[PDB]
Amino acid sequence: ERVVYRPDINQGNYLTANDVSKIRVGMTQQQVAYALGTPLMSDPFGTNTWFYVFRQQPGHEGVTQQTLTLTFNSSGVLTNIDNKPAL
Amino acid sequence: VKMSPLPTVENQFTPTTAWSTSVGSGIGNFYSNLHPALADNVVYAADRAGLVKALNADDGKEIWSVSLAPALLSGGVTVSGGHVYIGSEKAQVYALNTSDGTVAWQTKVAGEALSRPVVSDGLVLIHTSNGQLQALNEADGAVKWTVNLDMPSLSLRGESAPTTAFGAAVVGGDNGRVSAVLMEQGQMIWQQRISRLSDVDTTPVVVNGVVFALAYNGNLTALDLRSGQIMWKRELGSVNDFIVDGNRIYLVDQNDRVMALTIDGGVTLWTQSDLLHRLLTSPVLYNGNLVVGDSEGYLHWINVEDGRFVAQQKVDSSGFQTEPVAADGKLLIQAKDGTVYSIT
Amino acid sequence: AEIQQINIVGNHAFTTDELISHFQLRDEVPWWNVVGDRKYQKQKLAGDLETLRSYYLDRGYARFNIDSTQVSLTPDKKGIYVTVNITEGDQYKLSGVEVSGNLAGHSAEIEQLTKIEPGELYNGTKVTKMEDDIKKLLGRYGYAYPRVQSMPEINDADKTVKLRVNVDAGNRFYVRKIRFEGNDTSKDAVLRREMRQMEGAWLGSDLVDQGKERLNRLGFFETVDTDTQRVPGSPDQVDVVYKVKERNTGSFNFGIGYGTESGVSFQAGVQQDNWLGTGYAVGINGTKNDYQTYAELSVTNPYFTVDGVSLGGRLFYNDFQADDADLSDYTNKSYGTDVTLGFPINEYNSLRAGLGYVHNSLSNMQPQVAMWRYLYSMGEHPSTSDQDNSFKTDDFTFNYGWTYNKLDRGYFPTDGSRVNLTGKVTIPGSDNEYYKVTLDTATYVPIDDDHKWVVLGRTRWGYGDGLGGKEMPFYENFYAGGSSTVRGFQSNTIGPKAVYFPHQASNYDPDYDYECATQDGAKDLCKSDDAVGGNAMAVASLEFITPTPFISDKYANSVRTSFFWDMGTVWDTNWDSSQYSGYPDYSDPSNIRMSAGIALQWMSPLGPLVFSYAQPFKKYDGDKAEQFQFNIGK
Amino acid sequence: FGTIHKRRFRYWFCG
Amino acid sequence: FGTIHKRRFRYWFCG
Amino acid sequence: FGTIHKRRFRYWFCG
Amino acid sequence: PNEIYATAQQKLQDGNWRQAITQLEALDNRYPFGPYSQQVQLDLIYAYYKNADLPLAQAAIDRFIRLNPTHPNIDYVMYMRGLTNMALDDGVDRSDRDPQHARAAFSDFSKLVRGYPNSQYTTDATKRLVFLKDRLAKYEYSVAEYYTERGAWVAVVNRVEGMLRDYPDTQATRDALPLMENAYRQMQMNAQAEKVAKIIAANSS
Amino acid sequence: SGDEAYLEAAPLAELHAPAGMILPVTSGDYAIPVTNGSGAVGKALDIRPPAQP
């Protein structure tokens, strides 16, 4: 613990509880972008994978990290969803 | 750009002021149509402050006075029947009794009333600053009809007073369109353009059959009152009133030159540039000689036969801007300070 | 041409002159003073028309409309007549509000933020303020480009109006890149560490504004402004760009001379708060006379950690000889080390906690009453009849401090206040046992909405006392007078004056003046004007910052002119007026010195220059004035 | 900016 | 301050 | 009185 | 004109640039359409760049390039614009300062080498292009390094991904690949972390 | 002006793509085309403008 004031550090997309519920398999990546917003990170190394990260580091009272990994095939169809709401 | 110097002329006779007195604060530095008028051997005058005074034409003594207040009386003093009609900057047309000055009726008109009232066929005609013209009943004061003359974004201060002839009122406009309307219900017979170019017009006049009009920096034109088509044009322009008699036109132009033109084709007879850029008032005819004032107060009398000056007289220090009036052997001019001068 | 008359027709609720009084176009200009001119122009007519519209709208006249306006001019083209036709309509009161549309879950805040007192009169300015405040609230949550409209529907039976407002927050915008422009010298990390908006995160309008205001408070830049243009082709992506331009902060000067009053002089001075654009605060003062050898190095790293923890260190050495050759006159050696650690506890508050060591070596002090009180406090009993004495102390001090900084701007603040408390206390084992507290405040209250007229209240407080029977040493005394304190007085002269015992003066030469030299026949102790300062201090000043009456726009931001009124006194709380009756009472704080005058601060290329001229209208005996003063830094 | 007085040299640095 | 009797002025040496 | 404000010159010709 | 033009040429060869500005301006303002005017303006370009008149040099580049693009020595004007654009950019490393001047210099040299491959200045232009690319990559590396210090791991990933996208062959990008690895490790995505790790392993030697 | 700090800049070297994956696509806005090296450089290059009648 430290007494020094650290500002609120936020990173990534703002994943709410309802958009993660309405996202589903088999649906196209452009309408995924319409539903969820533009993903701030995507895989640059040859795979159509979108990384929806909800990173919050408020003060000294812990770090919260929800990551949603969306895998798209060559045609942009979402083939798999991977939601991890904790570290 | 410089005002011309005062011309030295040998006065054939020596005019004098029969009597003079002040009605109030007067028009002052403002620009207004307000001028005195004569009927029944008495003169009625007013100031911009709100004081309205009546004076006998022979002695110049006060007979009654009332205050309309700053009521800002803009329209000229016009007398007809038992009432006097004066327009105001506050869009009011006041009707005062000719006997004691008490108000007979007061009704708000649709716009700022600058033009001098014109009385005809039981109605009084007022042209407002916003272009549209209204006719008010002489007894009730209610507006009978309103005609919506168009208006450009920029115009000259002072609206044209309509002239009635053969049951139709011919009026100018700030867009250069002389308009003729019927007195019955205000419907429009014809309108014709006669003209940055402001194209503002002044009051027209009819001698017989043909209308005469003169727009500011436009054309002096002759139009038929029935058909409304133009007959002849001269490229002269003016905002002051002009007078017609015999076969000659007397007017003061844009640059305040005094000149005479014929009815038949508008050919000039003479022109005097001695009063160039001196702010002259509208010309009037008295004792067979043309009379004009200036902004310095020097009256100039012109012989109509060839334009020579016949008499020059220093009258008032404040100067003259409004319309002089002349009738029944008396001519009266109200200075900018409101002192009405009667000349012999 | 000029305005001959402004006329309003159809108005009945308000006087025509009262309506005109808000217009930039002036119907009349008074003769007894100059407040403008009647020069007509088209552009300001639209502004005055909009002002008239707003004036009718904020009094419940929702049905207000202007029928037409007629600009007209005299035939001689010198006068301009402007008239406006007015339909006032009835007066209405606001009967309620209704909110609809895609509120994006913020309905509980929107409805409360749009809540009204029932029966209140309609106000178009309040409607516009509500429209903008809804945008602010939605922008704080990342909805940087919302669609909001409000239309008034009017019931002509009930004489009331209803505001149906439609709100669509749109997409939540994310920032991908934050860019800095114009930082030619400042390191990018120096600007980037003042940020509160993080790259790769959802936007916060409050975060961007806080970053902008922290960059303003940093003081290294000027005209800091922001723009948040969208990334092309993306539903919700923005680039937030900070555009700044850099000033030459601080100054550096040196000087070498011969044969002056100080003899052969070599004086230098360094002060930069943004040293080489790295953010370090570096100060290198020093002089080398025949009488003084001085050097002071202070280096502070404000971001020793990424959280904003600062690590300052001050190293200094002072050696003063009152005479060159004989070395028997007054001598004062002073050297020490001072390292301090500061960290922020809040967005505007920071705390400092450091350790300070200082060594003072005194020899052949000239007898003075307060100084001798200090020596007897320390337990030493030297002889008062001669200038043969010596005293030497090593002091360890725990330096602490607290700073509150909510100023509008770093260099010439126009709003907010700054409070800076500094304190010291001696660690046990030190020779001196004392404590000191110093409080400095500066509050700026802007008089005008453009912040050109600002009133400034500066108060400077100081108090020190001994801790264990021993007294606070006189090298820690406060002084007043000069640019940094009450102006118009000679620098560091305000305060208690030394009282000299009749003593054998060292290296006495008959053709000079000495305060109680026994060679002069001084039977008793002397009243003098020699200032030694006091353990307590209270200085206050009120300044009225005004625009420079002759400057141009391009130079206005770097020149500050202000009228001021200074108040201050320095007094010695431990002085004994009973023992010394006829001599002045230096324990009395009621001798407040006052002055008023004009000051001119300038952000010159040679550094911040302050020129001042003050008249000490309240002045006491034994004190001298210096009306014109100037400072090389801040 | 630099100033040389009678056997006294001063200087100020800009930039 | 420090009184310089050799030069008749008070030398300010404090920081 | 020399001045070195990016140019070198004497403000008066002393002597 | 020539009676001072010859002396101006001799003295600009001699290096008294400060008043050489004055004689070249005296030719320019008195002979706007004179036969020597283009060469006088080019000499003004040279003296402006050699002197500390960098923004006056840039303005004169603008007012000469807008007057006549068809001048046969267009490559020299492009080269001088690139040189002065880098001169506004710049023993302490200053690559972490404002990179807009360096980016403008890179664009100027790139359009120079694309338009005029056979010019004598193209080799120096390409070497300066390499240096400017390295400097921009180092600026982006400095931003990524600060974001690693701060803890904005998404910002680190995006910045270094942009570095691979825009400056793939630079030493700063090769050095900042571990920043991508560390950011992926901190965000607990080992799938991307090991991929960046083997990117590094494929280029560490 | 006149500095030569750009001469000792590190030469560019393209990154090798390991098997089973593809490097991110390169933006061509910062590409340097290959050019003949038969030219002067640094102090050897003539900075003065070329003479013309």
TrEMBL record, chain A:
GO MF assignments: protein-macromolecule adaptor activity
Record localization: Cell outer membrane
Record has Lipoprotein as a keyword: yes
Domain Outer membrane protein assembly factor BamE residues, every copy: 12-81
Keyword Lipoprotein: yes
Keywords: Cell outer membrane, Lipoprotein, Membrane, Palmitate, Signal
Residue ranges crossing the lipid bilayer per the database entry: none
Membrane topology summary: Lipid-anchor
One GO term (biological process): protein insertion into membrane
Domain of life the protein comes from: Bacteria
Main location: membrane
GO cellular component: Bam protein complex
Function: Part of the outer membrane protein assembly complex, which is involved in assembly and insertion of beta-barrel proteins into the outer membrane.
UniProt record similarity statement: Belongs to the BamE family.
Self-association and partners: Part of the Bam complex, which is composed of the outer membrane protein BamA, and four lipoproteins BamB, BamC, BamD and BamE.
Protein's name in the database: Outer membrane protein assembly factor BamE
Provenance organism: Escherichia coli
Classification lineage: Bacteria, Pseudomonadati, Pseudomonadota, Gammaproteobacteria, Enterobacterales
First-to-last residue of the parent protein present: 24 to 110 of 113
Automatic annotation (TrEMBL), chain G:
Outer membrane lipoprotein BamD-like domain ranges (all copies): 1-198
InterPro entries found in the cross-reference section: BamD, BamD-like, TPR-like_helical_dom_sf
Biological processes per GO annotation: Gram-negative-bacterium-type cell outer membrane assembly; protein insertion into membrane
Entry keyword annotation includes Membrane: yes
Keyword Signal: yes
Membrane topology: Lipid-anchor
GO cellular component, one term: Bam protein complex
Origin superkingdom: Bacteria
Main location: membrane
Coiled coil spans: none
Subcellular location(s) per record: Cell outer membrane
Gene3D superfamilies per UniProt: Tetratricopeptide repeat domain
UniProt keyword terms in alphabetical order: Cell outer membrane, Lipoprotein, Membrane, Palmitate, Signal
Similarity annotation: Belongs to the BamD family.
Function: Part of the outer membrane protein assembly complex, which is involved in assembly and insertion of beta-barrel proteins into the outer membrane. Constitutes, with BamA, the core component of the assembly machinery.
Subunit structure, interactors included: Part of the Bam complex, which is composed of the outer membrane protein BamA, and four lipoproteins BamB, BamC, BamD and BamE.
Protein name (database record): Outer membrane protein assembly factor BamD
Lineage of the organism: Bacteria, Pseudomonadati, Pseudomonadota, Gammaproteobacteria, Enterobacterales
Automatic annotation (TrEMBL), chain H:
Domain of life according to the entry: Bacteria
Location relative to the cell: Cell outer membrane
Family statement: Belongs to the BamC family.
Summary of subunit composition and partner proteins: Part of the Bam complex, which is composed of the outer membrane protein BamA, and four lipoproteins BamB, BamC, BamD and BamE.
Function: Part of the outer membrane protein assembly complex, which is involved in assembly and insertion of beta-barrel proteins into the outer membrane.
Protein name: Outer membrane protein assembly factor BamC
Taxon lineage: Bacteria, Pseudomonadati, Pseudomonadota, Gammaproteobacteria, Enterobacterales
